[PDB]
Design an enzyme around this catalytic site. Structure first.
Site, PDB file in Angstrom:
ATOM      1  CD  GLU A   1     121.116  51.680 -13.112  1.00  0.00           C
ATOM      2  OE1 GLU A   1     121.535  51.224 -12.027  1.00  0.00           O
ATOM      3  OE2 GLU A   1     121.651  51.466 -14.221  1.00  0.00           O
TER       4      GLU A   1
ATOM      5  CG  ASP B   1     120.207  50.784 -17.028  1.00  0.00           C
ATOM      6  OD1 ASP B   1     121.030  51.665 -16.689  1.00  0.00           O
ATOM      7  OD2 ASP B   1     119.897  49.823 -16.308  1.00  0.00           O
TER       8      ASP B   1
ATOM      9  CD  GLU C   1     123.495  49.278 -19.146  1.00  0.00           C
ATOM     10  OE1 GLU C   1     124.353  49.209 -18.237  1.00  0.00           O
ATOM     11  OE2 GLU C   1     122.478  48.546 -19.151  1.00  0.00           O
TER      12      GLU C   1
ATOM     13  CG  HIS D   1     117.419  48.189 -13.452  1.00  0.00           C
ATOM     14  ND1 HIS D   1     118.277  47.127 -13.219  1.00  0.00           N
ATOM     15  CD2 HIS D   1     117.777  48.682 -14.660  1.00  0.00           C
ATOM     16  CE1 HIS D   1     119.094  46.983 -14.245  1.00  0.00           C
ATOM     17  NE2 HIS D   1     118.810  47.911 -15.136  1.00  0.00           N
TER      18      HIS D   1
END
Length: 430
Positions: A212, A214, A217, A228
């Site tokens: 993941e 991001d 965000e 991640h």
């Protein structure tokens, strides 16, 4: 899940492009889809298989659910879902009030024809978009990001799903998505744990995992770059107590690092950078680009013609730079001092693997019935305050509660647009 026959599925179109060099870009006529968790599910009597935040007796077991139910088309994307598309620009209305209900937050995936997601190759690449997030308030996370979803939304790997990407199946992320109603083309009934907060969601015994990234965000008071990886970066089904994340008993028991290595400015030392009328004035639209190299992930902005870089951290023992590097990721943990999950799953090296994982592009808005977005824009966790990185943002620790932000600013919405991608140096001339 079978594919429904009550409501056709009509993707809302969308332009974006690739840029081989700094003045060379050209459109990709695309289209977006909504995550399947927003869809109506029903047998052949239109009796739900789901309603409120829970399963009905149209179902019963894991398997048969997937054999008896079908999800459907979403009707009109302004109607129930507040999503507005014009040209390149995707809009997203936080709370939508319609003749039959109040929906809140959505998840959109970028596609590549109505059957399979567009898939991006990250490493040696940058992404650029436009964002107008002037009305996103504390307690709201307008994100844009990457997640190593499967192209067909899972319709090869898990043939119990006769729906697929076409109806935005197959989601995952380094939180290991246990709120989904199907996983692995299979149901999450048997153990569906309804929320005490949101009337339209639950948690089964199955999560959806994968790498993941991001990229974005955010709200108009703070942002955060967060890569991640996982010890398996490709989508995969975890088993209850072997699911980590937010929806679980153990955030850190699993294959993925739910917390990653984040570059949030406020958290890192500069509380006057981003926000209503700051260095990075959030109260108009601006350009964000984000770069994914080996051991170097980099972010910069363009707001009203000018290049803006993110200031380095002010924390003693962190490097003097605003980049995501092995250097960063280490030292911010003798600083914030707590659970180095990032490392636990194989450090940055592992995150470099994730970068070599074709991911799906996603856009999305929502609120936080677990943490009330504290972790993005204010003081988290509550539990000391006054400690390096506990401060994430200017917003109050009151804020973030669903019902209250939801009727306090329903018209909360994000303006996504002009999504470009290509080699580094190739999207913007900077």
């Amino acid at each position: 899940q079978r594919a429904g026959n009550e409501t056709p599925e009509n993707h809302p179109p969308l332009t974006w492009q690739r840029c081989t060099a700094p003045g060379n870009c050209q459109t990709v006529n695309a289209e977006v889809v909504i995550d399947a968790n927003w869809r109506w599910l029903h047998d052949d009597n239109m009796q739900n298989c789901y309603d409120g935040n829970q399963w009905t007796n149209a179902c019963s077991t894991a398997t048969d659910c997937a054999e008896k139910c079908m999800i459907e088309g979403a009707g009109d994307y302004l109607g129930t879902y507040g999503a507005s598309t014009s040209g390149d620009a995707l809009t997203l209305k936080f709370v939508t009030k319609h003749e039959y209900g109040t929906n809140v937050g959505s998840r959109f995936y970028l596609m590549n024809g109505p059957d399979k997601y567009q898939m991006f190759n990250l490493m040696g690449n940058e992404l650029a978009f436009d964002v107008d997030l002037s009305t996103v308030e504390c307690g709201i996370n307008s994100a844009l990001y990457f997640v190593a979803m499967e192209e067909d939304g899972g319709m090869a790997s898990y043939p119990s799903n006769q729906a697929g990407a076409r109806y935005g199946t197959g989601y995952c992320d380094a939180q290991c998505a246990r709120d989904l109603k199907f996983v692995g083309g299979k149901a999450n009934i048997e153990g569906w744990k309804s929320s005490t907060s949101d009337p339209n969601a639950g948690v089964g015994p199955y999560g959806s995992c994968c790498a993941e990234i991001d990229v974005w965000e955010s709200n108009a008071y703070a942002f955060a770059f967060t890569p991640h990886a996982c010890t398996t970066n490709e989508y995969h089904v975890c088993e209850t107590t072997n699911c980590g994340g937010t929806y679980s008993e153990d955030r850190f028991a699993g294959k993925c690092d739910a917390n990653g290595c984040d570059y949030n400015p406020y958290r890192m030392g500069n509380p006057d950078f981003y926000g209503k009328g700051k260095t990075l004035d959030t109260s108009r639209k601006f350009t964000v680009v984000s770069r994914f190299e080996e051991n170097k992930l980099s972010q910069y902005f363009i707001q009203d013609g000018r290049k803006i870089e993110i200031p380095p951290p002010t924390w003693e023992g962190m490097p003097n730079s605003s980049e995501i590097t092995p250097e960063l990721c280490s030292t911010m943990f003798d600083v914030f001092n707590d659970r180095n999950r990032f490392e636990e799953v194989g450090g940055f090296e592992q995150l470099n693997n994730a970068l070599r994982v074709p991911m799906v592009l996603v856009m999305s808005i929502w609120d936080d019935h677990y943490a009330n977005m504290l972790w993005l824009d204010s003081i988290y966790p509550p539990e000391k305050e006054g400690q390096p990185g506990a401060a994430r943002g200017d917003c109050p620790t009151d804020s973030g509660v669903p019902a209250e932000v939801e009727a306090q600013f329903p018209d909360a919405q994000v303006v996504w647009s002009n999504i470009r991608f290509g080699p580094i140096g190739s999207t913007y001339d900077f």
